[PDB]
C-alpha cells in the first residue's frame, strides 16, 4: 500500500526491455517508474535527469526541487525523474514475479540503472544529450556513473552530497543499516509476510539513520524542535520511524547493496583518477558541510581529479538528510548554484 | 578472567566501605581498584587523579600516557588511576554478591564515582587536594563533576574529550550501543552463562565503535593500514571486535547508563552555567578535532563558560579512539599542553 500512485504519482511505468545485469542475471522485463516535468524542445537540448535517492521516490524529488522559481524549473526545462530498480516503483523485489520475486530480486548496481536510463532516454524520448544530471547521494552516484559512462551525452552534471567512488566507512555504515534490518528475526530471509512484520528491524534502521544522517550541531542548537519535535525521542519516533515504517524490508536491502558499491572506477580497472578523467561534462560537486559520512573531505578529493570541475559546499547544520528539505537557506544556496550551471556553456 | 591483575595490574583493591548511591541504593562495601605511580611529595601537593574510561581500565591509562618522558611523569607526580564502579576491576556486576549481583547491579552514575574518588583519597591516602584531574571521555565527566562538586579540592583539571553535560545525540549513540549488546538472546536479559555466548551483541557493538569512534578520514587516508590492517575488514575483526570480545556485557551496560547520563548540572537544579561557573580549577577544554559525538562544537560551548579556561583541541583525524594513543603526533601535543597546563602558579 506504500508504493502506489496515489502516494508517488503521477508517474508513468516504461517498460524498456531485457535487462542484462552486470552481476550477471537478466531481467526479462525492466519497468523503470518515470515522471516528467515540463516540455521538451525541438532541439530537445533542455532535458535535465533526475536520479531518485536511497529509499525515495520520484515524488520526493517533485516535492522538494522542482517548480516555478526554482531551477529545476518545468517552464524551461523537461525534467526527467527516473525512480531506482528496486526502488518499489520501478521493477523491484517487491513488485516483479516468478523468480525475481522478494528476496530473489537480483544485486543491482548503479551501473545498471544508468544503462537502463540511456536505454530510456534515447529510444523512448530520442533524446541524444542532458543539459544536466543531477541528483543527491544516489542520486550523485547515478550521476557520477553517468558522467563517466557516456562522457559525451552528459553536458553538465551536479553531485550533491555523493561520491563518485565508494569508501570504506561509508561501505560499513550500510552494512551496519542492513544488519538492522536483516538480524530481526521476523525478516524470515526476505519472506516475511508483510512490510510491518519487520517493524523492529525497521525502527532499529530508522535509529540509525538519526545518528548518522544529520549532525551533532543539528540536535545541540535544537533543529529538531525548529522542525516541530520537541525532543529527541519524540524526533525519532515522530519522523525518523514514521519515515521508514511503511517500506519494504527487500526493497531497502536492494539500494543498500548497490550504494555500497558504487565506483566509476569499474570503468577503468579501479585507476579512479583516470575514470573521473574522462568526465567531459561541467560539474559542481556539492557535499553537505556538517554531512558525517558523504565528506566535505571525500569529496573534495574527488573533485581535484574532475577537469574543468567546480568545488561549491552547501553549508547546512542539517546535514546529510538536509537532502529531505528542511532547510530552506540551504534549498536557496543549491537553486542559485544549479542556475549558474544550467547558465554556463 | 579478562578482568584479572594480570592483565590489568598492578592495582590495589582499596573497600572504602558504604557507598550511598544517588539513585537510592546503598553499596554496602565499594571496592575500588586503585593503581599509583609515583611517590607523594613532603605535603602531598603533587597528586594527579586520572579516572578510567568507557570499558577500560587503569592499564590503559599507564600504558598510553604515564612515564618519565610525558606530562604525567611518576618521577615528579603521584599518579592515582581510580578504575570506574561498574568496570570489572572495582566493585561491578561482575565481581559483587548479594543483591548486586550481575543484572542485579545498581545505577551508578558519574557523581558516585567521584563521592568515591573523593573518600579514596582524603580518608586513605590523606591528600586534601589534586595538583590536576585529567582523564577522557568518560574520563572526562568525571574530570568536570570533580572540578564543579569539590572546586576548591582541584586545582587544574584536563578534560580530554568529553562534555560536562551529556547531549541528546550523545545519549541516542549510546542506546543504540546498548541495544546492539541487550537484543542479542544469548544476553537472556544479564543472566548469560559466559561472556562468550554473547559473542554477536559484542561484535555489533564494536562495529557501532568502528563506525562512530574514528573518522571518515581516519579510513579515507589509510590509518588502519599504518596501524598494521591491510582492509577495514581486518580492522574490524582484528582490532575493534577482538577488543571487546573477552569483555563482561553487564559491566558494559553499567558504564554506558552512567555515561549517558553525566550531567554537572545536577548540582544546580539543571543550570549548567552556574554549574561550570563554581569552578575554580585552571581548566583546559581539549575535544579531539575529528571526534564525531563529542564534537568540537559541544565542547567549545562549554568552555565558553568556565571561568579562567582555554580551548585547546587536539588535532587528530583518528577522532575519539585516537584516545587509544594510536596518533602519536596527538599524544605529542597533549604532552605538551598538560605540561603547561602543570606550570601555572600555585595560588
Same mark, same amino acid.
Given at each position: ?67 516555478? &522559481? ?15 530498480? &528496486? ?17 530473489? /530480486?537480483?544485486?543491482?548496481?548503479? &551501473? ?67 544488519? $538492522? ?7 524470515? $530471509? ?27 550541531? /543539528? ?9 516541530? /519535535? ?13 519515515? /521508514? ?90 537553486? $542559485? ?9
Amino acid at each position: 500500500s506504500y508504493y502506489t500512485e496515489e502516494n508517488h504519482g503521477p508517474f508513468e511505468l516504461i517498460n524498456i526491455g531485457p535487462l542484462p545485469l552486470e552481476e550477471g542475471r537478466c531481467m526479462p522485463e525492466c519497468l523503470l517508474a518515470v515522471a516528467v516535468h515540463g516540455a521538451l524542445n525541438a532541439d530537445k537540448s533542455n532535458a535535465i535527469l533526475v536520479p531518485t535517492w536511497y529509499s525515495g521516490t520520484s515524488k520526493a524529488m517533485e516535492q522538494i526541487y522542482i517548480g516555478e &522559481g526554482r531551477a529545476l524549473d518545468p517552464s524551461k526545462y523537461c525534467i526527467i525523474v527516473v525512480n531506482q530498480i &528496486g526502488n518499489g516503483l520501478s521493477s523491484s523485489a517487491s513488485n516483479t514475479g516468478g523468480s525475481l520475486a522478494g528476496p530473489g /530480486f537480483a544485486n543491482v548496481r548503479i &551501473g545498471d540503472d544508468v544503462s537502463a536510463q540511456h536505454t530510456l532516454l534515447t529510444e523512448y524520448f530520442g533524446i541524444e544529450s542532458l543539459a544536466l544530471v543531477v541528483g543527491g547521494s544516489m542520486g550523485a552516484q547515478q550521476t557520477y556513473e553517468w558522467a563517466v559512462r557516456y562522457p559525451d551525452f552528459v553536458k553538465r552534471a551536479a553531485a550533491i552530497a555523493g561520491t563518485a567512488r565508494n569508501s570504506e566507512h561509508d561501505f560499513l555504515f550500510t552494512e551496519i543499516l542492513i544488519e $538492522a534490518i536483516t538480524t530481526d528475526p521476523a525478516f524470515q $530471509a526476505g519472506l516475511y509476510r508483510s512490510s510491518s512484520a519487520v517493524a523492529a528491524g525497521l525502527e532499529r534502521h530508522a535509529k540509525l539513520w538519526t545518528l548518522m544522517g544529520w549532525s551533532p550541531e /543539528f540536535f545541540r542548537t535544537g533543529r529538531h524542535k525548529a522542525l516541530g /519535535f520537541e525532543s529527541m525521542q519524540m524526533f525519532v519516533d515522530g519522523f525518523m520511524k514514521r519515515y /521508514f515504517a511503511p517500506m519494504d524490508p527487500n526493497n531497502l536491502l536492494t539500494m543498500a547493496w548497490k550504494w555500497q558499491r558504487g565506483d566509476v572506477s569499474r570503468h577503468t580497472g579501479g585507476d579512479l583518477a583516470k575514470a573521473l578523467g574522462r568526465i567531459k561534462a561541467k560539474t559542481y560537486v556539492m557535499p553537505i558541510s556538517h554531512d558525517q559520512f558523504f565528506t566535505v573531505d571525500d569529496c573534495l578529493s574527488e573533485q581535484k581529479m574532475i577537469p574543468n570541475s567546480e568545488f561549491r559546499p552547501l553549508r547546512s547544520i542539517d546535514g546529510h538528510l538536509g537532502l529531505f528539505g528542511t532547510d530552506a537557506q540551504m534549498l536557496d544556496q543549491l537553486d $542559485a548554484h544549479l542556475a549558474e550551471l544550467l547558465s554556463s556553456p
